Structures are given as structure tokens and as C-alpha cells.
Design an enzyme around this catalytic site. Structure first.
Site, PDB file in Angstrom:
ATOM      1  N   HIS D 202       0.806  -1.208   0.000  1.00  0.00           N
ATOM      2  CA  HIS D 202       0.000   0.000   0.000  1.00  0.00           C
ATOM      3  C   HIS D 202       0.847   1.269   0.000  1.00  0.00           C
ATOM      4  CE1 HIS D 202      -2.762   2.997   1.845  1.00  0.00           C
ATOM      5  NE2 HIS D 202      -3.684   2.347   1.161  1.00  0.00           N
ATOM      6  N   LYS D 228     -11.882  -8.304 -13.943  1.00  0.00           N
ATOM      7  CA  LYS D 228     -10.766  -9.000 -14.567  1.00  0.00           C
ATOM      8  C   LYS D 228     -10.282 -10.167 -13.716  1.00  0.00           C
ATOM      9  CE  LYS D 228      -6.220  -7.991 -16.430  1.00  0.00           C
ATOM     10  NZ  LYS D 228      -5.544  -7.387 -17.579  1.00  0.00           N
TER      11      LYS D 228
HETATM   12  C1  LIG Z   1      -3.499 -23.690 -12.470  1.00  0.00           C
HETATM   13  C2  LIG Z   1      -4.701 -22.845 -12.894  1.00  0.00           C
HETATM   14  C3  LIG Z   1      -4.597 -21.430 -12.331  1.00  0.00           C
HETATM   15  C4  LIG Z   1      -5.630 -20.528 -13.027  1.00  0.00           C
HETATM   16  C5  LIG Z   1      -5.151 -19.345 -13.878  1.00  0.00           C
HETATM   17  C6  LIG Z   1      -3.760 -19.494 -14.476  1.00  0.00           C
HETATM   18  C7  LIG Z   1      -3.507 -18.395 -15.494  1.00  0.00           C
HETATM   19  C8  LIG Z   1      -1.997 -18.209 -15.646  1.00  0.00           C
HETATM   20  C9  LIG Z   1      -1.610 -18.016 -17.106  1.00  0.00           C
HETATM   21  C10 LIG Z   1      -0.386 -17.113 -17.165  1.00  0.00           C
HETATM   22  C11 LIG Z   1      -0.864 -15.670 -17.228  1.00  0.00           C
HETATM   23  O1  LIG Z   1      -1.520 -15.221 -16.356  1.00  0.00           O
HETATM   24  O2  LIG Z   1      -0.534 -14.899 -18.341  1.00  0.00           O
HETATM   25  C12 LIG Z   1      -1.204 -15.266 -19.508  1.00  0.00           C
HETATM   26  C13 LIG Z   1      -0.585 -14.509 -20.671  1.00  0.00           C
HETATM   27  C14 LIG Z   1      -1.624 -13.618 -21.333  1.00  0.00           C
HETATM   28  O3  LIG Z   1      -1.896 -12.527 -20.510  1.00  0.00           O
HETATM   29  P1  LIG Z   1      -2.023 -11.076 -21.258  1.00  0.00           P
HETATM   30  O4  LIG Z   1      -2.619 -10.075 -20.308  1.00  0.00           O
HETATM   31  O5  LIG Z   1      -0.654 -10.630 -21.689  1.00  0.00           O
HETATM   32  O6  LIG Z   1      -2.989 -11.257 -22.575  1.00  0.00           O
HETATM   33  C15 LIG Z   1      -4.312 -10.817 -22.496  1.00  0.00           C
HETATM   34  C16 LIG Z   1      -5.133 -11.362 -23.660  1.00  0.00           C
HETATM   35  O7  LIG Z   1      -4.468 -11.104 -24.861  1.00  0.00           O
HETATM   36  C17 LIG Z   1      -6.503 -10.695 -23.682  1.00  0.00           C
HETATM   37  O8  LIG Z   1      -7.453 -11.550 -23.130  1.00  0.00           O
HETATM   38  P2  LIG Z   1      -8.989 -10.987 -22.972  1.00  0.00           P
HETATM   39  O9  LIG Z   1      -9.136 -10.248 -21.670  1.00  0.00           O
HETATM   40  O10 LIG Z   1      -9.302 -10.061 -24.117  1.00  0.00           O
HETATM   41  O11 LIG Z   1     -10.016 -12.266 -22.985  1.00  0.00           O
HETATM   42  C18 LIG Z   1      -9.934 -13.139 -21.902  1.00  0.00           C
HETATM   43  C19 LIG Z   1      -9.378 -14.477 -22.354  1.00  0.00           C
HETATM   44  C20 LIG Z   1      -9.155 -15.314 -21.105  1.00  0.00           C
HETATM   45  O12 LIG Z   1      -7.789 -15.475 -20.888  1.00  0.00           O
HETATM   46  C21 LIG Z   1      -7.428 -15.730 -19.564  1.00  0.00           C
HETATM   47  O13 LIG Z   1      -8.197 -16.178 -18.787  1.00  0.00           O
HETATM   48  C22 LIG Z   1      -6.010 -15.398 -19.132  1.00  0.00           C
HETATM   49  C23 LIG Z   1      -5.481 -16.432 -18.151  1.00  0.00           C
HETATM   50  O14 LIG Z   1     -10.314 -15.076 -23.203  1.00  0.00           O
HETATM   51  C24 LIG Z   1      -9.869 -16.129 -24.012  1.00  0.00           C
HETATM   52  O15 LIG Z   1      -8.756 -16.529 -23.919  1.00  0.00           O
HETATM   53  C25 LIG Z   1     -10.856 -16.741 -25.010  1.00  0.00           C
HETATM   54  C26 LIG Z   1     -10.632 -18.244 -25.224  1.00  0.00           C
HETATM   55  C27 LIG Z   1     -11.658 -19.064 -24.444  1.00  0.00           C
HETATM   56  O16 LIG Z   1      -0.126 -15.410 -21.634  1.00  0.00           O
HETATM   57  C28 LIG Z   1       1.245 -15.421 -21.924  1.00  0.00           C
HETATM   58  O17 LIG Z   1       1.917 -14.442 -21.893  1.00  0.00           O
HETATM   59  C29 LIG Z   1       1.873 -16.750 -22.306  1.00  0.00           C
HETATM   60  C30 LIG Z   1       0.896 -17.859 -21.930  1.00  0.00           C
HETATM   61  C31 LIG Z   1       1.554 -19.224 -22.110  1.00  0.00           C
HETATM   62  C32 LIG Z   1       2.380 -19.571 -20.872  1.00  0.00           C
HETATM   63  C33 LIG Z   1       1.524 -20.118 -19.728  1.00  0.00           C
HETATM   64  C34 LIG Z   1       2.313 -21.154 -18.926  1.00  0.00           C
HETATM   65  C35 LIG Z   1       1.953 -21.070 -17.448  1.00  0.00           C
HETATM   66  C36 LIG Z   1       2.467 -22.321 -16.738  1.00  0.00           C
END
Ligand SMILES: CCCCCCCCCCC(=O)OC[C@H](COP(=O)(O)OC[C@H](O)COP(=O)(O)OC[C@@H](COC(=O)CC)OC(=O)CCC)OC(=O)CCCCCCCC
Ligand SMILES: CCCCCCCCCCCCCCCCCC(=O)OC[C@H](COP(=O)(O)OCCN)OC(=O)CCCCCCCCCCCCC
Ligand code: HEM
Ligand code: HEM
Ligand code: HEM
Ligand SMILES: COc1c(O)c(C)c(C/C=C(\C)CC/C=C(\C)CC/C=C(/C)CC/C=C(/C)CC/C=C(\C)CCC=C(C)C)c(O)c1OC
Ligand SMILES: CCCCCCCCCCCCCCCCCC(=O)O[C@H](COC(=O)CCCCCC)COP(=O)(O)OCCN
Ligand SMILES: COC(=O)N(OC)c1ccccc1COc1ccn(-c2ccc(Cl)cc2)n1
Lengths: 75, 248, 54, 385, 93
Positions: D202, D228
Site C-alpha cells: 500500500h 478481470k
Molecule cells: C493452475 C490454474 C490457475 C488458473 C489461472 C492461471 C492463469 C496463468 C496463465 C499465465 C498468465 O496469467 O498470463 C497469460 C498470458 C496472457 O496474458 P495477457 O494479459 O498478456 O494477454 C491478455 C489477452 O491477450 C486478452 O485476453 P482478454 O481479456 O481479451 O479475454 C480473456 C481471455 C481469457 O484469458 C485468460 O483467462 C487469461 C489467463 O479469453 C480467451 O482466452 C478466449 C478463449 C476461451 O499469456 C502469456 O503471456 C503466455 C501464456 C503461455 C504460458 C503459460 C504457462 C503457465 C504455466
């Protein structure tokens, strides 16, 4: 009447050419042995050669060739 | 380690309960308990399964009450403190053959046969390993291996030598429903019964998970819609710069 | 249209309608999934085996 | 003014949840801290409902957990959620820490926030270890034996520490009853460290992926970043439900369904997947005392990073060399887990030694040398004479 | 209470940045625009553009460590075969 169904398919695939390419190799090993630990100083051998490896090769091919085809016939 | 000291890999059989929407086959459970009672129970216990849990799964209430009454259980002492006995009831647990570990090893040449209530979950391979073990005893051990006296060879056990001998053979059990009681048939029904003994929530669990996954999957898509609507002002906002006069 | 001041506006009956529909949704959603599951696995269940061992 | 700003208690909710200024450019990697807070609520609630049916006596313990599975209504849901919920808690924490390492969040003015976090990590390994021992199967007995016997090598004082930890002469009944009472406690200490962690955030607020100031463009938290965060809450619940209901024993070992026996050793004593890289670091040191020091040093070398990064830029976004070695370090951390699940045999002995060196050389030799090289390249590319 | 040692971030009105002059901002309501408007031209344009940039920093490291695990696992299985028992008794000593 009905014999063991697994014993039938196990027996069938021992008459293919990736079946006898694994049967013979397992055996001639079983020959080659005999003598290889019969002889003298055998209770006194250092390493006596066996045949688990080539048995395993035969019973690995035969099983994962027979696995997806058995339970179709067993009630 | 070598492959013998590890054991032979169990194959992948096509079990009828494998799948996210499948249940146990309950006619194979009923037949499997018959193989347990007539072959296995001479030397294996089932201490964690109660009589009542069979009602509505493999046997009728009237059937299970009659199976339990064929065994005697310790009652509480009488008016003078001497011990009594009584027949079984539904709240009792399935009894084992031996009274202690010493008597079990005495009757099996020093080795102890394990309880089977959790044997499907407590072994790598699961049902494929239990089935392959019982149906895996060869005619002769491979030439070269020297077994101790009192041990038997089958390659699915780590090491290669196991204290159990082959116990399954064709047509030793006469099934009530007229199924041919081959070696593989009884082995399959035994393993299915034993998996139910380890996982008696299998059928309910797979049906509550269909409800939970459908609800949460739609909430996840609805949340993506709502977010992109409430963020549309920020994503298309525009900026312009006009350099002021540096009078200030 | 004028769905606003009967569906959207009145939050008193919105939160009401959210909860009132939550209870109705559960009853019909449960009955529907339990019918699909019991039908997909027909011939394995105990209530059918019990009839075949007559 | 508004009631949410004037009330003593709601003023804190407003300042942390509703009106908090956030940088406009933060991405979905900034959502992991929210998930770790839901994780802690899942574990504390599921654990208290199981403790109503658990018995800690060594002769009653294994059978109490099987009694939760068979006789308790919905008890199989509580355990599998709880057991798989700890695997998920650790995976989100590794990603939270790897993010801060990539974007430079450890640097000043946020050195105090990084240090309270290192404490949370230590107390969290301790919690999980104590809970696995309370099942009292065969990986539970022999895992506690191997770790507690390490403290018998401390000079002149070691054999007094093990007998006071055991309550006797071996892992026995007094050991299992004290490990359950401590296992209930430490989660409430982690929660108090999470409040101190938020107080330190904070002050300066959050950073952003570009590594520059965020005071020129700020968005409030409510209805941009609350909604979000719902996106990743429901994805977390979905994947967790898929493990609890359809594959609930793939992240475990079968030997822990065998009851614990001091007289029969397993053929392979292996920890859970999230303590394997630290278990390979220990096994790599031939001496017993140096091994237990090198293992705890692997957690506390993270405190050295604020003084070894010698760069004028925060974060790795615009840094080419420092990106390559960030991903070397990540995949070297995955090999240490694999080697920790193998037998002690050639060539897995030397592989774990070279990989234990690369874990330590990253923080102490690589970061200082590449940071200095990158500074000087930025200068001579612009200022050239 | 008393005031404590101050920060590098303030609050609304006194956030603590430089003075701004000559910048204009425009925006439109979300109710007046259509959502889910272009999210192809997003997963095929921008995701592929973002992938193509940051993929040689992740995959060259991954290829070095996976090759290493391979040659070790291959060599171990040879040592504990019967054709590699002579080498085992050489290296294990
Ligand atoms: C164990 C479960 C826990 C639950 C949650 C885990 C989530 C962790 C994933 C890692 C992360 O947080 O970063 C993800 C990153 C993209 O983040 P960004 O803000 O740069 O892009 C925003 C986007 O373009 C707009 O996305 P928008 O907001 O427009 O739509 C939402 C999107 C949902 O995506 C998500 O939920 C993100 C997790 O809708 C769709 O995908 C539609 C298909 C159904 O992607 C990357 O940079 C690389 C991703 C591959 C590496 C992942 C390996 C992790 C081990
Ligand atoms: C004791 C403590 C020790 C802890 C050791 C930690 C090891 C835990 C392993 C966790 C894996 C997470 C790796 C990713 C780290 C998160 C931060 C990050 O990578 O930044 C995302 C970055 C964003 O891209 P940009 O560089 O363009 O910046 C944003 C635009 N302004 O884009 C990228 O950098 C690429 C993102 C792709 C991530 C996936 C690569 C890794 C894939 C397999 C990993 C396997 C893990 C099990
Ligand atoms: C269909 C009948 C039977 C089944 C399904 C069965 C099942 C099993 C199983 C699963 C094991 C454990 C193997 C392992 O640890 O990997 C085992 C071991 C054993 N069984 Fe059986 N059993 C049966 C009948 C019998 C009988 C009738 C006897 C005695 C006459 C017997 C004696 C033993 C012994 C002594 C062991 C210990 C093996 C060892 O530790 O080396 N079994 N059995
Ligand atoms: C940070 C929070 C916690 C973590 C990470 C954690 C971790 C664990 C783990 C890994 C196990 C072994 C899982 C297994 O059965 O394989 C376990 C078991 C157990 N834990 Fe926790 N725990 C936490 C909080 C709690 C709390 C607060 C309680 C009690 C109120 C609790 C009660 C139990 C009990 C009773 C068991 C017995 C075995 C079981 O039911 O699975 N846990 N815990
Ligand atoms: C285990 C419980 C934890 C909780 C509940 C928690 C919570 C949070 C939250 C809500 C944030 C703000 C949002 C974000 O940056 O994702 C945050 C930021 C941060 N956390 Fe944690 N955290 C935990 C553990 C840790 C650990 C283990 C570390 C490091 C070893 C750590 C270091 C940081 C840092 C450096 C930031 C600031 C990142 C930035 O502003 O760029 N935290 N934490
Ligand atoms: C960046 O801005 C953020 C932010 O992004 C986020 C996500 C959060 C959200 C929260 C966190 C990150 C973590 C904080 C969490 C805690 C301190 C957790 C406390 C946990 C608990 C589990 C308390 C539980 C207490 C109980 C009484 C329940 C236990 C048992 C019960 C009810 C059984 C008894 C029942 C009967 C019927 C007898 C912020 O606070 C925040 O502001 C800074
Ligand atoms: C304790 C953990 C450490 C961190 C601090 C915890 C802070 C989080 C608290 C969560 C918010 C709680 C909601 C409070 C609701 C508003 C309170 C209120 O109306 O204040 C009072 C009445 O409250 C009470 O009588 C008892 C409240 C007990 C609440 C127990 C949960 C209203 O009186 P007033 O209008 O003067 O507002 C106070 C001005 N300072
Ligand atoms: C989840 O539980 C297990 O995996 N346990 O413990 C029963 C297990 C099981 C089998 C083999 C080894 C272990 C232990 O492995 C490790 C490696 C490091 N720690 C540790 C423990 C406490 C502290 Cl302060 C710091 C480090 N423990």
C-alpha cells in the site's frame, strides 16, 4: 468347452513374424545357456547368464498386441 | 535398476468403467464376490468392507442377511462375566481367516498375504496390474533363473519371485447366471469387485462432476463477455498532444 | 423495449428474480442430468441387473 | 463524505479494494496474488471440517482418513479438494515469484515486500510437510525419518535436537500427535504475515510491465480489475474440479495407501512433486551437515538479489541477454525435480551436482555480470564518438 | 495519529507525478459500442505476432535441457542391461 480366451490370442500371435523373431532369440539363449552354467566351478561361477530380458521382449510385444482385443470376448 | 527388479509393464485393457461418463458393471461385481468367497478368502482378509454396503450394489437385503449369519462374532459377556458368541448382522465387518499375523505367516511359509480392501489404489498400474498378475504365471520359469524352494515365478512382480502360487484354473466355479467360468473371466470379475471395494463412491462422484463442470464452464464464458464490455471505453480511448508555450 | 422497468430497472425484484430462479434452476437441472447419466449407462445399473436375476 | 470513506472499518476496505489506484497497463500475471488468497481460504475451511473426524493416535490415524472417505457424507470431496488444493497453491506461488523476478519487483522501493514473502514460503513448506505425516502411510513414516535425522549432525548438540523433536527414540506416537497440533497452528501465522505483506504494498503500490512510473495514468480497482479477476477465479475452480472429480490420485504416490510400518522400507522414498528440486540439492552434497545447510541456503539466497542486480533499468522487458538466462534458470529448476525422483545412479549423480551449481551461480555470478554489460551497451550505442 | 515517512505514490489529487499541460483525452461509452467486435483479427493477428517475437528466448533453453535429460536416460538404461554390465562395474567404482 470354452478355453481361456487370453490363452488363445496369446497362442495365435506366437505365429506371426514379429512373434518368432522374439521366440527364437529368447530360446537360442536357452540353448547357449545349458552349457553356460552346466560345466565345472558353476556353484563357483562369478556371473551366470540367464534369459529374463528376452522373455520380457516377447511378453511385451505379445501383451500390448493382445490388450485391446480381449475384453470384447469376455462377458 | 534392471527391468526384472522393476517388473514388467502392465498393458492397457479396455475396462468398461474407464471413461468420464461410465459406471461400474454391477453384474461383474456380483460374480466377482463369488470368486472371492470360494477362492481368495481362504488366505486374504477384507477388513474395511461392511456387510450393509453390499445391499443395493450386488446383492439383495435378504441375501446379505443370510450371508452374515453364517459367521460367529464376539458378543458382550453374560450376567456372570463369561464370554458369549452370536451370529453376524448387517453392521458387522467381513471376517478374515486368521486371528493374528503369526498364524498367517505359519500357514504360508513365513510370508504374509496383504489385505485387499485398498490393493487397487495401493499399486502402480491399478486394475491392469491385478489382472495381469493373476493371468501371468508361465508354464516354466525362464532358463537360468534360480528360484528358492517355495517361491513361484511371474514377471509382473518386482524381482520375479512371488510367494503366491497360481490359484485360478478353468471351470472351478459354477456361476449362477450361466457364464463360462474361464480363467480370464474370473480374473476380470475379481478385479472389478476389488476396485469397488477401494472406491465405493465411483458412480456418484462421476455424476456430480458433470453438474459442476457444466456450471463452471458457462460462468467462465459469461465472465469473459462481461469483462470485455466494461473495458471497451479504455481500449479505444485516444490521446492528442499540442505543445504549449514555455512562458511558464 | 419496455423490458427495462419490469426486468432490468427494479433491482428489488432483480435480486429477487436471481434467487427465485436459482432454486427452480437447481431442481430441473438435477433431474435432467440424472436422467441422461442413468440412460447412458443402461444395462450396468443394479436396478436393471436385479430384474434380470428374476 | 461517503460512508465507505468515513467508517473506521469500511475505510480500509475502500482503500484496498474499491478506490485503490492501479497502473493502467498491468496484465493477467498480476492476478496470481488474488488466487493465493482464495487458496488459503479453501485449505483452512476444508481442514477444519475434517478435523472433526480425525484421530491423531498412531494406531488410529490411517483408519480415520479411510473413515472420512467411506462413512462421512461428502468426505471424499473434502479430502481430494484439500489434497489437490495444496498442489495448486504451490503452483500459483511459483508463478507469482517467477513474475516478480522477471519484472524486477524485488528492487527498491519494494525490498521489504520481497522479504516478508520469502518468510511465507518457508512457513508453507513446513505446513505441507507436517500434514503429509499425519496420514501415516508408508511415505509418511520414512519421509519424516530421513528429514528429522539430518539434525543429528549439528556439532555436539544434534542428538539432543532429534530426541526433543521426536519425543523419544524414533518416529513414534508422540511425534504424530505433536505434528498435527502444529499443523493446525502455522496456517494462522501465514495469515498474519499476509496482512503485513499487504501493508508494505500500500505504501508504493504495484509496479507495471514497462518498469517506469505509473503515476501519470491510473484506474481504480472496482469494476475494471475486480471483473478481470473473476476471469481467473473461474478458470482456477474449473481445472481444480476436473482433478477432484475425474483424476483425484494422479498427483500422489500409491505407497501412502499402505499403512506405515517401521520394519519394511520402501524401494523408493520420494517426496511430493513440489519439494523434489530441493530434495535433489540435498542429495548432491556428500556430507550430511553441509547438505542440510545447502538446502536451506537455496531458499535464503533469494534475499541477496536486491544487491546483486546492478542495472539502472527495472525489469527484463527491454533486456535481451537477461531474458535468455531467466529461462535457463526456469528449466534448470524443472530438471532438479526430475532428478529428485530418480534412483541414485550414474549419470544422475553428476547431473544434479552441475545443476545445483547453476542454481546458485545465477543469483551470485550471472546477474551482476550481465547487468553491467547491458548498461554499458546502452551507453555506447547512443553516445558514440 | 502522526504522519510517517513518505512514499513515491500519493492518492487521488496528489498522486506525485510531474505537472501536465497540453494533453487531451477522448473516450466513448461502452453501452454505445458493440462488444466482442474483433477477437479474430486478435488471436490470429496479435497472438501470432506476440508469439513470433518471444519464442526463441524460451525454446533454445528448453532444447538444451531436454537433450541433456535424454542422453542421460539413454545411457542409464544401457548400464543396467546385460550388454552394459562391464561398463557399470567400471564407472560405479
Ligand atoms: C493452475 C490454474 C490457475 C488458473 C489461472 C492461471 C492463469 C496463468 C496463465 C499465465 C498468465 O496469467 O498470463 C497469460 C498470458 C496472457 O496474458 P495477457 O494479459 O498478456 O494477454 C491478455 C489477452 O491477450 C486478452 O485476453 P482478454 O481479456 O481479451 O479475454 C480473456 C481471455 C481469457 O484469458 C485468460 O483467462 C487469461 C489467463 O479469453 C480467451 O482466452 C478466449 C478463449 C476461451 O499469456 C502469456 O503471456 C503466455 C501464456 C503461455 C504460458 C503459460 C504457462 C503457465 C504455466
Ligand atoms: C525457491 C524459488 C524458486 C522458484 C523458481 C521459479 C520456477 C517456477 C516456474 C514458473 C513458470 C512461469 C514462467 C513465466 C514467468 C512469469 C513472468 C513472465 O514470463 O513474463 C511474461 C512475459 C510477457 O511478455 P513481455 O516481455 O513482452 O512483457 C509484457 C509486455 N509489456 O512473457 C514471457 O516471458 C513468456 C511467457 C511464457 C511463459 C511460459 C514459458 C515456460 C513454459 C514451461 C514452464 C514449465 C513450468 C512447470
Ligand atoms: C483369486 C485369488 C487371489 C487373488 C486375487 C489374490 C491377490 C493377491 C495380491 C493382489 C497380492 C499382492 C501382490 C503384490 O504385492 O504385488 C497377493 C499376494 C499373496 N497371496 Fe494372494 N490372492 C489370491 C489367492 C491367494 C491364495 C488362495 C493364497 C494362499 C493359498 C494366496 C497367498 C498369497 C501370498 C502368500 C501372497 C504374498 C506374496 C509375497 O509377498 O511374495 N493368495 N495376492
Ligand atoms: C496452508 C494451509 C494448509 C496446507 C498447505 C495443508 C496441507 C496438507 C497436506 C499436503 C496434507 C496431506 C494430504 C494428503 O492426505 O495426501 C494435509 C492433511 C491434513 N490436513 Fe492440512 N493443510 C493446510 C491447512 C490445514 C488446516 C488449517 C487444518 C486443520 C484445521 C488441516 C488439517 C488436515 C488434516 C486433518 C489432514 C489429514 C489427512 C487428510 O485429511 O488428507 N490442514 N494438509
Ligand atoms: C502466499 C501468500 C501470498 C499472498 C496472499 C500474496 C498476495 C499478493 C497480492 C494480492 C499482491 C498484489 C497483486 C500482484 O502483484 O499479484 C502481491 C504482490 C507481490 N507479492 Fe505476494 N503474496 C503471497 C506470497 C508472496 C511470495 C511468496 C512472494 C515472493 C517470494 C511475494 C512477493 C510479492 C511481490 C514482490 C509483489 C509485488 C509485485 C509487483 O508489484 O510488481 N508474495 N502479493
Ligand atoms: C492488490 O489489492 C488486493 C488484491 O488484489 C486482492 C486480490 C486482495 C484480497 C486478499 C488477499 C490477497 C489475502 C487475504 C486473506 C486472508 C488474510 C485469509 C484469512 C483466511 C481464513 C480462512 C479465515 C477463516 C475463518 C473462519 C472462522 C472460517 C473457518 C471455519 C468454519 C466457518 C467452520 C465452523 C462452522 C460451524 C457451522 C460451527 C486484497 O486484499 C487486495 O488489497 C491489497
Ligand atoms: C481484524 C483483522 C485486521 C485487519 C482489520 C479488519 C478490517 C476489515 C473489517 C471488514 C468490514 C466490517 C464491516 C463493518 C460494518 C460497518 C460497521 C459500523 O456500522 O460501525 C458503526 C456500528 O458498528 C457497530 O456497532 C459494531 C460493528 C461490529 C462489526 C463486526 C464485524 C457505525 O457507527 P458510525 O456511523 O459512527 O461509523 C463509525 C465511524 N468511525
Ligand atoms: C509433503 O510431504 C513430503 O513430501 N514429505 O514429508 C513427509 C516427504 C516424503 C518422502 C520423502 C521426503 C519428504 C520430505 O521432503 C522434503 C524436502 C525438504 N523438506 C523440508 C521440510 C521442512 C522444512 Cl522446514 C524444509 C524443507 N522436506
Amino acid at each position: 468347452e470354452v478355453t481361456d480366451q487370453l490363452e488363445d490370442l496369446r497362442e495365435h500371435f506366437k505365429n506371426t513374424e514379429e512373434g518368432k523373431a522374439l521366440v527364437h532369440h529368447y530360446e537360442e539363449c536357452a540353448e547357449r545357456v545349458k552349457i553356460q552354467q552346466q560345466q565345472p566351478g558353476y556353484a563357483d561361477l562369478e556371473h551366470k547368464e540367464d534369459c529374463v530380458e528376452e522373455f520380457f521382449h516377447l511378453q511385451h510385444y505379445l501383451d500390448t498386441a493382445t490388450a485391446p482385443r480381449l475384453f470384447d470376448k469376455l462377458k | 535398476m534392471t527391468a526384472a527388479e522393476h517388473g514388467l509393464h502392465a498393458p492397457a485393457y479396455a475396462w468398461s468403467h474407464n471413461g468420464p461418463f461410465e459406471t461400474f458393471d454391477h453384474a461383474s461385481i456380483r460374480r466377482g464376490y463369488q470368486v472371492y468367497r470360494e477362492v481368495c478368502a481362504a488366505c486374504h482378509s477384507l477388513d474395511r468392507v461392511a456387510w450393509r454396503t453390499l445391499v443395493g450394489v450386488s446383492h439383495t437385503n435378504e441375501e446379505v442377511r443370510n450371508m452374515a449369519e453364517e459367521f460367529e462374532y464376539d458378543d458382550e459377556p453374560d450376567e456372570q462375566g463369561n464370554p458369549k458368541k452370536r451370529p453376524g448382522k448387517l453392521s458387522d465387518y467381513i471376517p478374515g481367516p486368521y486371528p493374528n499375523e503369526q498364524a498367517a505367516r505359519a500357514a504360508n511359509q513365513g510370508a504374509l498375504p496383504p489385505d485387499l480392501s485398498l490393493i487397487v489404489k495401493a499399486r502402480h498400474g491399478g486394475c491392469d496390474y491385478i489382472f495381469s498378475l493373476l493371468t501371468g504365471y508361465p508354464d516354466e520359469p525362464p532358463a537360468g533363473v534360480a528360484l528358492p524352494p517355495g517361491s513361484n515365478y511371474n514377471p509382473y512382480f518386482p524381482g520375479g519371485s512371488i510367494a503366491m502360487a497360481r490359484v485360478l484354473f478353468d471351470d472351478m466355479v459354477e456361476y449362477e447366471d450361466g457364464t463360462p467360468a474361464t480363467t480370464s473371466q474370473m480374473a476380470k470379475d475379481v478385479t472389478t469387485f476389488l476396485n469397488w471395494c477401494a472406491e465405493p463412491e465411483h458412480d456418484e462422484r462421476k455424476r456430480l462432476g458433470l453438474k459442476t463442470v457444466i456450471i463452471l464452464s458457462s460462468l467462465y464464458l459469461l465472465s469473459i463477455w462481461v469483462k470485455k464490455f466494461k473495458w471497451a471505453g479504455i481500449k479505444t480511448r485516444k490521446f492528442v498532444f499540442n505543445p504549449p508555450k514555455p512562458r511558464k | 423495449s419496455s423490458l427495462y422497468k419490469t426486468f432490468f430497472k427494479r433491482n428489488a425484484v432483480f435480486v429477487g428474480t436471481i434467487f427465485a430462479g436459482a432454486f427452480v434452476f437447481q431442481t430441473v437441472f438435477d433431474t435432467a442430468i440424472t436422467s441422461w447419466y442413468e440412460n447412458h449407462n443402461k444395462g450396468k445399473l443394479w436396478k436393471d441387473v436385479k430384474a434380470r436375476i428374476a | 463524505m461517503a460512508f465507505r470513506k468515513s467508517n473506521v472499518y469500511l475505510s480500509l476496505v475502500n482503500s484496498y479494494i474499491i478506490d485503490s489506484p492501479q497502473p493502467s497497463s498491468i496484465n493477467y500475471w498480476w492476478n496470481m496474488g488474488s488466487l493465493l488468497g482464495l487458496c488459503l481460504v479453501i485449505q483452512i475451511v476444508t481442514g477444519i471440517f475434517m478435523a472433526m473426524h480425525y484421530s491423531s493416535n498412531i494406531e488410529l490415524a490411517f483408519s480415520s482418513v479411510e473413515h472420512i472417505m467411506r462413512d462421512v457424507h461428502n468426505g471424499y470431496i473434502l479430502r481430494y479438494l484439500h489434497a489437490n488444493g495444496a498442489s495448486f497453491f504451490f503452483m500459483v506461488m511459483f508463478m507469482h515469484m517467477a513474475k516478480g523476478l522477471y519484472y524486477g519487483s524485488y528492487r527498491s522501493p519494494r525490498v521489504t515486500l520481497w522479504n516478508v514473502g520469502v518468510i511465507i514460503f518457508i512457513l508453507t513448506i513446513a505446513t505441507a510437510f507436517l500434514g503429509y505425516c499425519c496420514v501415516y502411510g508408508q511415505m509418511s513414516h520414512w519421509g519424516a525419518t530421513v528429514i528429522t535425522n539430518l539434525f543429528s549432525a549439528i556439532p555436539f548438540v544434534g542428538n539432543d535436537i532429534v530426541s526433543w523433536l521426536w519425543g523419544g527414540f524414533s518416529v513414534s506416537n508422540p511425534t504424530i500427535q505433536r505434528f498435527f497440533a502444529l499443523h493446525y497452528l502455522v496456517p494462522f501465522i501465514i495469515a498474519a504475515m499476509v496482512i503485513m505483506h499487504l501493508m508494505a504494498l500500500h505504501i508504493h503500490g504495484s509496479s507495471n510491465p514497462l518498469g517506469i512510473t505509473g503515476n501519470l495514468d491510473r484506474i481504480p480497482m472496482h469494476s475494471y480489475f475486480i471483473f478481470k479477476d473473476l476471469v481467473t477465479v473461474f478458470l482456477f475452480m474449473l481445472i481444480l474440479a476436473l482433478f477432484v472429480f475425474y483424476s483425484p490420485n494422479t498427483l500422489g504416490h500409491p505407497d501412502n495407501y499402505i499403512p506405515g510400518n517401521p520394519l519394511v522400507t520402501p524401494a523408493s522414498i520420494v517426496p511430493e512433486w513440489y519439494l523434489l528440486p530441493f530434495y535433489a540439492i540435498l542429495r548432491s552434497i556428500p556430507d550430511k551437515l553441509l547438505g542440510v545447510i545447502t538446502m536451506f541456503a537455496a531458499i535464503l539466497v533469494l534475499l541477496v538479489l536486491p544487491f546483486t542486480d546492478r542495472s539502472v533499468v527495472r525489469g527484463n522487458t527491454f533486456k535481451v541477454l537477461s531474458k535468455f538466462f531467466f529461462f535457463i534458470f526456469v528449466f534448470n529448476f524443472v530438471l532438479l525435480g526430475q532428478i529428485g525422483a530418480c534412483h541414485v545412479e550414474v549419470p544422475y549423480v553428476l547431473m544434479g551436482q552441475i545443476a545445483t551449481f547453476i542454481y546458485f551461480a545465477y543469483f551470485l555470478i550471472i546477474v551482476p555480470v550481465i547487468s553491467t554489460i547491458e548498461n554499458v551497451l546502452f551507453y555506447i550505442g547512443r553516445v558514440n564518438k | 495519529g502522526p504522519p510517517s515517512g513518505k512514499t513515491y505514490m500519493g492518492w487521488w489529487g496528489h498522486m506525485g507525478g510531474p505537472k501536465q499541460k497540453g494533453i487531451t483525452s477522448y473516450a466513448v461509452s461502452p453501452y454505445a459500442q458493440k462488444p466482442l467486435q474483433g477477437i479474430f483479427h486478435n488471436a490470429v493477428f496479435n497472438s501470432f505476432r506476440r508469439f513470433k517475437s518471444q519464442f526463441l528466448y524460451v525454446l533454445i533453453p528448453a532444447g538444451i535441457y531436454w537433450y541433456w535429460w535424454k542422453n542421460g536416460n539413454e545411457y542409464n538404461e544401457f548400464l543396467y542391461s546385460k550388454a552394459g554390465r562391464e561398463e557399470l562395474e567400471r564407472v560405479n567404482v
